[PDB]
């Protein structure tokens, strides 16, 4: 039931939300820390609720501040989708207790409590995975809380402070202290606040919510060990100077803080000059297939292979790949491709697998155990079957030794299984190791003739020749750009060139032995490389006791780019 | 930055059956890589095409849950293995776990 409505205003965070980052004790020391905090002068979204989309995102960490006295604010629910498809948490903080239920609980519209049934929060899930309990002693004033989750660890910080009659957040500071830790360990992307409404009755509430971010702070400990001052490091150049000098006061003079760079915008890549198209039409259908004992092998290279058109050539169901994936064949670039085509019986398709044992496995076709490729088999009952009976396909039956990987037999002779020689006559202890396949249209499924094509790939050992046609990112110009050119990772500005690279140079370096002029493997063009502009930043300030005004200067940069 | 102990032992004597053991599955497809020490139990039809899968495993519709095949006649790398890993949280809070040191 929807019976709660909400309004939003906005405020500046001033400077609040500094919590003891660690469990240690220090005194009269200016320390530096990097962690999640609420940046100073942030943009807090005041919520005013009266009696709605209360699915407030959680992000990395949440700072929740309230000033009400009726204790009408109670509980905090966290989750990712808050439905019966993904696991969700059930933190329900009441007067003096806390309970957790984490599984795929579904959630309704208004997560409120009747007041005390949480049935309006969850209904059911598969045998719930986890249930936990814990017992705290929880209790004109401001109440501030900070919740965060790091590496599957939920930690809560709190502080109760007195405030006079005022309408906004005050000045000054207030350190926060830890209360509870627990390792839930999941993706929480949203959370929800909860209130008390007695049956119902009209309700009023107001609170402030802010989102944490990773930052670097400098904190000052007094002689008593209590935090009394803190300065950000990514707010103003004066703040950066304070962070660098590791002091809260900056004397009259000029100091150097950090450096500025032109962050490159996009990224680009390289691919070679391949324009040929691999001939998959001739292999997948030729109105005739070689026998299993003499399988047809074709080598494909120096062309672009489009494996998406394979489905349109043969009437099969799905691919069967071991070293790679069927959907990941258009990205990797291979040196050579091998295609082995034959026709076998219906039940012997199972023998076409790595490390197989059987007549076909060790007498007709053997595959190395480290096969990295695909196998496609599909029925051939409408072309390889005759009412009289097909007899043009034969398979070997007897062999002295098992077949070596990727080895075929073509020689035909009279196999001997006795002491006396065969002498060219198929008498006793003399056999013919070539059995003709029997294919009929009335045979069972396991006996129907099946066309089988095995594709074997070669990894990047030689300059590759077979891969998909994705442009070399349509070479950009006059922009600082990231790039991964042929395994070379870096950034740079790319411009035209006036240098005469000789016919077959790929990289050309400088005195520093770093590249300055370049070709393109997709189109023979000559280009120049420069470093993106960068420099240093200096800050000129008077004495801190005089004024807070500062001046910023970029060293050795024309006053046009900045 | 892993610090801890790993104990692995081949369990082909109990996780292999003559018919073939499919007790264990693995996820084959995922939109994004996994954060350290994170699992994934949610099961749905993975979509690899522009059109929605609509809960039917047709074209451009895959199952990101492939069953393992465990047999006692398979190779050593194909035999099932049982692994127990112990990881330690060092001294940041009041330590709770250690041996029987006399006070």
């Amino acid at each position: 039931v929807n019976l709660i409505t909400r309004t939003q205003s906005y405020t500046n965070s001033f400077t609040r939300g500094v919590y003891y980052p660690d469990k240690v004790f220090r005194s009269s020391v200016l320390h530096s820390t990097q962690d999640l905090f609420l940046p100073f002068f942030s943009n807090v979204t005041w919520f005013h609720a009266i009696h709605d989309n209360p699915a407030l995102p959680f992000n990395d960490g949440v700072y929740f501040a309230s000033t009400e006295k009726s204790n009408i604010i109670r509980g905090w629910i966290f989750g990712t989708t808050l439905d019966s498809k993904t696991q969700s948490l059930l933190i329900v903080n009441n007067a003096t207790n806390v309970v957790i239920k984490v599984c795929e609980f579904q959630f309704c519209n208004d997560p409120f409590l009747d007041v005390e049934s949480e049935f309006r929060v969850y209904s059911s899930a598969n045998n719930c995975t986890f249930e936990y309990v814990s017992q705290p002693f929880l209790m004109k004033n401001l109440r501030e809380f900070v919740f965060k989750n790091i590496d599957g660890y939920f930690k809560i910080y709190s502080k109760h402070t007195p405030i006079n009659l005022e309408r906004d957040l005050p000045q000054g500071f207030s350190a926060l202290e830890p209360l509870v830790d627990l390792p839930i360990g999941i993706n929480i992307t949203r959370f929800q606040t909860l209130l008390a409404l007695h049956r119902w009755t009209a309700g009023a509430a107001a609170y402030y919510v802010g989102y944490l971010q990773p930052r670097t702070f400098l904190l000052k400990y007094n002689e008593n060990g209590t935090i009394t001052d803190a300065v950000d490091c990514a707010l103003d150049p004066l703040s950066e100077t304070k962070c660098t000098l590791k002091s809260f006061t900056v004397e009259k003079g000029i100091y150097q803080t950090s450096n500025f760079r032109v962050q490159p915008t996009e990224s680009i890549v390289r691919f070679p000059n391949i324009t040929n198209l691999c001939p998959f039409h001739e292999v997948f259908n030729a109105t005739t297939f070689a026998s299993v004992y003499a399988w047809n092998r074709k080598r494909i290279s120096n062309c672009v292979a489009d494996y998406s058109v394979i489905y349109n050539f043969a009437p099969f169901f799905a691919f069967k790949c071991y070293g790679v994936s069927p959907t990941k064949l258009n990205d990797l670039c291979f040196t050579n491709v091998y295609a082995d085509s034959f026709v076998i019986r219906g039940n012997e398709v199972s023998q076409i697998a790595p490390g197989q044992t059987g007549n076909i496995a060790d007498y007709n076709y053997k595959l190395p155990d480290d096969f990295t490729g695909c196998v496609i088999a599909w029925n051939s009952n409408k072309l390889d079957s005759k009412p009289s009976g097909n007899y043009n396909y034969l398979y070997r039956l007897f062999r002295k030794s098992k077949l070596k990987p990727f080895e075929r037999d073509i020689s035909t002779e009279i196999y001997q299984a006795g002491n006396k020689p065969c002498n060219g006559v198929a008498g006793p202890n003399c056999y013919s190791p070539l059995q003709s396949y029997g294919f009929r249209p009335t045979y069972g499924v396991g006996h129907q003739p099946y066309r089988v094509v095995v594709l074997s790939f070669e990894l990047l050992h030689a300059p590759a020749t077979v891969c998909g046609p994705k442009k070399s990112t349509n070479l950009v110009k006059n922009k600082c750009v990231n790039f991964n050119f042929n395994g070379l990772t870096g950034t740079g500005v790319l411009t035209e060139s006036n240098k005469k690279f000789l016919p077959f140079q790929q990289f050309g370096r400088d005195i520093a032995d770093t590249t300055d002029a370049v070709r393109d493997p997709q189109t023979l063009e000559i280009l120049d490389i420069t470093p993106c502009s960068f420099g240093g930043v200096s800050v000129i300030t008077p004495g801190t006791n005089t004024s807070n005004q500062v001046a910023v200067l970029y060293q050795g940069v024309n006053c046009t780019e900045v | 930055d892993f610090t801890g102990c790993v104990i692995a032992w081949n369990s082909n004597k109990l996780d292999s059956k003559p018919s073939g053991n499919y007790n264990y599955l693995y996820r084959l497809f995922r939109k994004s890589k996994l954060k350290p020490f994170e699992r994934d139990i949610s099961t749905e039809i993975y979509q690899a095409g522009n059109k929605p899968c609509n809960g039917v495993a047709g074209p451009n519709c895959y199952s990101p849950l492939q069953s393992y095949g465990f047999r006692p006649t398979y190779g050593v790398g194909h035999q099932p293995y049982r692994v127990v890993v112990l990881s330690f949280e060092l001294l940041h809070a009041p330590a709770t776990v250690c041996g029987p040191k006399k006070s």
Partner: nanobody
Amino acid sequence: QVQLQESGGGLVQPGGSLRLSCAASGFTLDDYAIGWFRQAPGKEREGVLCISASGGSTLYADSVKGRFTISRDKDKNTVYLQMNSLKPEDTAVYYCAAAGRLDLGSGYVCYGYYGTDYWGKGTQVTVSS
């Protein structure tokens, strides 16, 4: 850890109604297709009906179509059936069973028939006739 216990049954006149349930305790498989079988004295055990675990894609048999109404409840992880209009040909020993789903062709397909991982103790359903 995984146990299948079955409750219900008895002897009723033809055309009567019966409710029989089998409860799965300790089940841990994410995808599964629990199977249901019956065996009269002197005949082989055959499948009866099943539905998908993910969404409840129902399936029946020709002999028991319409008469055998089934539903799966994930709260108790048990299977419930409504059986009405009993005939003497339904006199058999009914066993409840659970098995894992098939993963072939990169899809989720529920299969029954043989190849069942687990089975129940079974009961007796008798028609006076």
